[PDB]
Design an enzyme around this catalytic site. Structure first.
Site, PDB file in Angstrom:
ATOM      1  N   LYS D 154       0.817  -1.210   0.000  1.00 39.23           N
ATOM      2  CA  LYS D 154       0.000   0.000   0.000  1.00 39.23           C
ATOM      3  C   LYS D 154       0.853   1.263   0.000  1.00 39.23           C
ATOM      4  O   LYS D 154       0.552   2.222  -0.710  1.00 39.23           O
ATOM      5  CB  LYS D 154      -0.959   0.007   1.189  1.00 39.23           C
ATOM      6  CG  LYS D 154      -1.956  -1.116   1.174  1.00 39.23           C
ATOM      7  CD  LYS D 154      -2.876  -1.042   2.356  1.00 39.23           C
ATOM      8  CE  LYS D 154      -2.148  -1.111   3.654  1.00 39.23           C
ATOM      9  NZ  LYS D 154      -1.353  -2.344   3.725  1.00 39.23           N
ATOM     10  N   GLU D 180       0.040   5.497  11.298  1.00 42.33           N
ATOM     11  CA  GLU D 180       1.013   4.656  10.615  1.00 42.33           C
ATOM     12  C   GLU D 180       2.386   4.813  11.269  1.00 42.33           C
ATOM     13  O   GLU D 180       2.531   5.491  12.277  1.00 42.33           O
ATOM     14  CB  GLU D 180       1.043   4.959   9.124  1.00 42.33           C
ATOM     15  CG  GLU D 180      -0.111   4.302   8.416  1.00 42.33           C
ATOM     16  CD  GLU D 180      -0.069   2.801   8.564  1.00 42.33           C
ATOM     17  OE1 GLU D 180       1.031   2.224   8.469  1.00 42.33           O
ATOM     18  OE2 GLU D 180      -1.136   2.194   8.793  1.00 42.33           O
ATOM     19  N   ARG D 181       3.403   4.191  10.676  1.00 40.21           N
ATOM     20  CA  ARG D 181       4.729   4.106  11.280  1.00 40.21           C
ATOM     21  C   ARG D 181       5.471   5.434  11.275  1.00 40.21           C
ATOM     22  O   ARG D 181       5.519   6.124  10.260  1.00 40.21           O
ATOM     23  CB  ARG D 181       5.575   3.068  10.557  1.00 40.21           C
ATOM     24  CG  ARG D 181       5.069   1.666  10.648  1.00 40.21           C
ATOM     25  CD  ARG D 181       5.919   0.757   9.793  1.00 40.21           C
ATOM     26  NE  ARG D 181       5.467  -0.618   9.829  1.00 40.21           N
ATOM     27  CZ  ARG D 181       4.619  -1.142   8.969  1.00 40.21           C
ATOM     28  NH1 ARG D 181       4.012  -0.380   8.091  1.00 40.21           N
ATOM     29  NH2 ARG D 181       4.283  -2.403   9.083  1.00 40.21           N
TER      30      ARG D 181
END
Ligand SMILES: Nc1ncnc2c1ncn2[C@@H]1O[C@H](COP(=O)(O)OP(=O)(O)OP(=O)(O)O)[C@@H](O)[C@H]1O
Ligand SMILES: [Mg+2]
Lengths: 83, 173, 107, 458
Positions: D154, D180-181
């Site tokens: 993604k 997210e990260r």
């Protein structure tokens, strides 16, 4: 006759010695499966270490309106209502 | 809020007070039992986990005025079911039952000015016709009302204000 | 002296009220007269107000509300050691063979 | 003025005097030791109690703390002052630079544009990527969703779309990091600064590290900046790092807010919460937003409510398959599930439309044969069925491509492929122009010329 009744009550509570717990102090209300419910602890904070009798702690997970919900960092089975 | 759990008790106390012709005392009695409930240290005890009876007898001790074996036993019932904090809502419902039974209504009347008193004679006579009850007025002067008056009775309202009629007219975009 | 009273009985689950300064700890064993035999109850939860909640170690039928309850202050205790060998017992450590009492030294 | 009266995880109840109770979505403020905590009002309970979500860590909160009532919603800086800077859900600067030179702040809670305002557009936007603009092409001002499970591609796909689109496009862009990260936020920031393209990009980050309340609201902070640039009359690109995390942060608080569970335990409000976010991401007669969203698919279950609701929102949907990715075909797009509103003969024209439907028909028929082949093996097939398989396998390989951002993994140099080369290429395979080449010739070659040069050396 309201200010009188209020005063009378305040006098009568003392005459019967009914009084609060100290802040930072409380009592175990109920005990099950390592979850502990405590009444009092009006100054406890979310995620605090609560020291139990013996040499062990519970972690405060919920500050409910009337109680603190906590989980015991050890064996729980010797704890009892009213400690 | 306690209203729904207070209803069953409020009826029983009023019914009992009717049989024993003591309604006035009971009202002054419940008024004390509600007021001790509002004290701080007493409140803490009520939120506590004291077993019913031990809670009840420590409550009854403070409620010295209470008629023993009637008012004091009503506390024991509510202490079994832990409804003591509902007492402010067990009262007032007792007053509502009383006002219904006495066929009497408090009705309220709000205007831009202190009403002319002669007007209040007409208003009370009209309200005693609209509703088949004796009507106590306790009218008010209010800045919000541009002119005219609001009549409020139970949960029925008859807006006669210019404020209401302008914002009723401003509606028609 | 018995100090509790039974306050509910819903199948195997039995609730007992004790004086507030006497509540059993968890896993403590209680006993009651179920008519003409003693029935043991094991404590599962301390609820608020001196009420404790227990599982019956036997048939629950015939219990009334208001029966007296004796608080044995230990858990379930069972006989151990050489005297147990070749004997059949139930969970309570009572002999299920007919072969008389177990000559226990400890429980 | 207010008092704290309960603290349950991320949720805090506050009591106020009954003449003064805060409105819904008002910001409150409380001092938590040596820092300030904002709370956002969610519900009015009875009796002047109000229920709120903490925009920060709720540990160390006592009952009985005094709470200050701010008279307004959460408001964030907007405009050119935000360009080139990293900001928090609360609109605070999170880079080590100074304060943001705001001229205006906007409330993050807004209504969507009216039906009269919306605009249509059919301008096809080209991408570097063979499968995407063949199978699921998309327009300027449209919405794209990348659906996939954990670890399927993604982010890498969205990084090629940023590289290809957002550098041949000339206007401003907004990148919203949602749950997210943090490493990947830092990696992105630098290459933007190393490329000196950073000064066209506003970045908002609310990573997984953060407490629930941050992950819930940070998406709205990102849209509110993009809506300022759109209303200024610009054409804007909005990238959302994982839309699924917005719904999940709703799930985490919903039970503490006292709402009965629904479905697979989701909040009952799931479709309204998603819809009220999604309807704001629209191009308008005043200006345009082009949007790419990543959509995590929990347990690879495309029939889960959170993916299922998202599919109706979007104009192009590209679906990534773990089963393909474990072949090592990348990008792992499933062409039998990926689809677009733009795959229509009127907008694309007939050659593209016929090529896409041919590819779709051969690959469908290959799925129908795979259960025969699994038990019997291929030798039992008919000699035309063997030709369908022999072509489909070449088609599956030729959908693979080297990406410039993926060079760190495969070493091999990346490729940008013009749309004309894709149509010509797949049309030749289905016509059998290439039936003499081996399958390996098609894997990871940019264009059909590169397949024939690879075939010479096998
Ligand atoms: N085009 C590609 N070429 C080579 N490798 C790829 C490609 N796409 C994905 N991969 C491999 O898959 C890994 C994960 O891809 P990516 O980080 O985009 O997954 P994701 O869908 O964002 O996963 P997550 O949901 O964990 O964020 C990459 O590090 C790479 O190893
Ligand atoms: Mg990712």
């Amino acid at each position: 006759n309201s200010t009188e009744i209020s005063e009378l009550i305040k006098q009568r509570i003392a005459q019967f010695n009914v009084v609060s717990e100290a802040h930072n102090e409380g009592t175990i209300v109920s005990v099950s499966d390592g979850v502990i419910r405590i009444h009092g602890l009006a100054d406890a904070m979310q995620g605090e270490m609560i020291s139990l009798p013996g040499n062990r702690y519970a972690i405060a997970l919920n500050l409910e309106r009337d109680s603190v919900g906590a989980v015991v960092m050890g064996p729980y089975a010797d704890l009892a209502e009213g400690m | 809020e306690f209203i729904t759990v207070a209803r069953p008790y409020a009826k029983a106390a009023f019914d009992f007070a009717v049989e024993h012709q003591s309604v006035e005392r009971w009202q002054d009695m419940l008024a004390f039992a509600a007021e001790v409930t509002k004290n701080e240290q007493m409140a803490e005890l009520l939120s506590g986990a004291l077993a019913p009876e031990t809670l009840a007898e420590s409550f009854i001790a403070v409620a010295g005025e209470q008629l023993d074996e009637n008012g004091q036993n009503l506390i024991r019932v509510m202490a079994e079911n832990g409804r003591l904090n509902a007492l402010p809502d067990v009262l007032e419902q007792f007053i509502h039952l009383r006002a219904v039974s006495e066929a009497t209504a408090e009705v309220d009347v709000i205007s831009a000015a202190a009403l002319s008193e002669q007007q209040l004679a007409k208003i009370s006579a009209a309200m005693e016709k609209r509703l088949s009850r004796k009507v106590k007025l306790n009218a008010k002067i209010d800045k919000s009302v541009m002119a005219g008056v609001i009549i409020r009775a139970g949960d029925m309202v008859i807006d006669g204000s210019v404020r209401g009629r302008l914002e009723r007219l401003a509606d028609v975009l | 002296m018995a100090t509790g009273k039974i306050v509910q009985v819903i199948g195997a689950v039995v609730d007992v009220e004790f004086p507030q300064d006497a509540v059993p700890r968890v896993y403590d064993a209680l006993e009651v007269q179920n008519g003409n035999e003693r029935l043991v109850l094991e404590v599962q939860q301390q609820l608020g107000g001196g009420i404790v909640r227990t599982i019956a170690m036997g048939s629950s039928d015939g219990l009334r509300r208001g029966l007296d309850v004796k608080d044995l202050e230990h858990p379930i205790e069972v006989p151990v050691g050489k005297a147990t060998l070749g004997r059949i017992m139930n969970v309570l450590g009572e002999p299920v063979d007919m072969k008389g009492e177990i000559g226990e030294e400890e429980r | 003025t207010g008092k704290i009266v309960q603290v349950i995880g991320a949720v805090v109840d506050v009591e106020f005097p009954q003449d003064a109770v805060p409105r819904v979505y008002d910001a409150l403020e409380v001092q938590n030791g040596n820092e300030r905590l904002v709370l956002e009002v969610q519900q009015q309970l009875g009796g002047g109690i109000v229920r709120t979500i903490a925009m920060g860590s709720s540990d160390g909160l006592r009952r009985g703390l005094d709470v200050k009532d701010l008279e307004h919603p959460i408001e964030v800086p907007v405009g050119k002052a935000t360009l080139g800077r990293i900001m928090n859900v609360l609109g605070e600067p999170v880079d080590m630079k100074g304060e943001i030179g705001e001229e205006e702040r906007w409330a993050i809670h807004r209504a969507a544009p009216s039906y009269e305002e919306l605009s249509n557009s059919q301008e096809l936007l080209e991408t570097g990527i063979k499968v995407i603009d063949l199978m699921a092409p998309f327009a300027k001002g449209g919405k794209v969703g990348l659906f996939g499970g954990a670890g399927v591609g993604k982010t890498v796909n969205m990084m090629e779309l940023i590289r290809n689109i957002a550098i041949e496009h000339s206007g401003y862009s907004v990148f919203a990091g949602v749950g997210e990260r943090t490493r990947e936020g830092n990696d992105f920031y630098h290459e933007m600064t190393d490329s000196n393209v950073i000064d066209k990009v506003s970045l908002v980050y609310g990573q997984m590290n953060e407490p629930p309340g941050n992950r819930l609201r940070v998406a709205l902070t990102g849209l509110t900046m993009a809506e300022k640039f759109r209303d200024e009359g610009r054409d804007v690109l909005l990238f959302v790092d994982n839309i699924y995390r917005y719904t999940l942060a709703g799930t985490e608080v919903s039970a503490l807010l006292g709402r009965m569970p629904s479905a697979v335990g989701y909040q009952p409000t799931l479709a309204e919460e998603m819809g009220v976010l999604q309807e704001r991401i629209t191009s308008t007669k005043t200006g345009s937003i082009t949007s790419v969203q990543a959509v995590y698919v929990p347990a690879d279950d495309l029939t889960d409510p959170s993916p299922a609701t998202t599919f109706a929102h979007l104009d192009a949907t590209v679906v990534l398959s773990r089963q393909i990715a474990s072949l090592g075909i990348y990008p792992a797009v499933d062409p039998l599930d990926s689809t677009s509103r733009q795959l229509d003969p009127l907008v694309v024209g007939q050659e593209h439309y016929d090529t896409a439907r041919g590819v779709q028909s051969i690959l469908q028929r290959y799925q129908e044969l795979k259960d025969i082949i699994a038990i019997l093996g291929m030798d039992e097939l008919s000699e035309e069925d063997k030709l369908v398989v022999a072509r489909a396998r070449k088609i599956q390989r030729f959908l693979s491509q080297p990406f410039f951002v993926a060079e760190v993994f495969t070493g091999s140099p990346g490729k940008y492929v013009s749309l004309k080369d894709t149509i010509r290429g797949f049309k030749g395979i289905m016509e059998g122009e290439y039936d003499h080449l081996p399958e390996q010739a098609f894997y990871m070659v940019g264009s059909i010329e590169e397949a024939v040069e690879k075939a010479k050396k096998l």
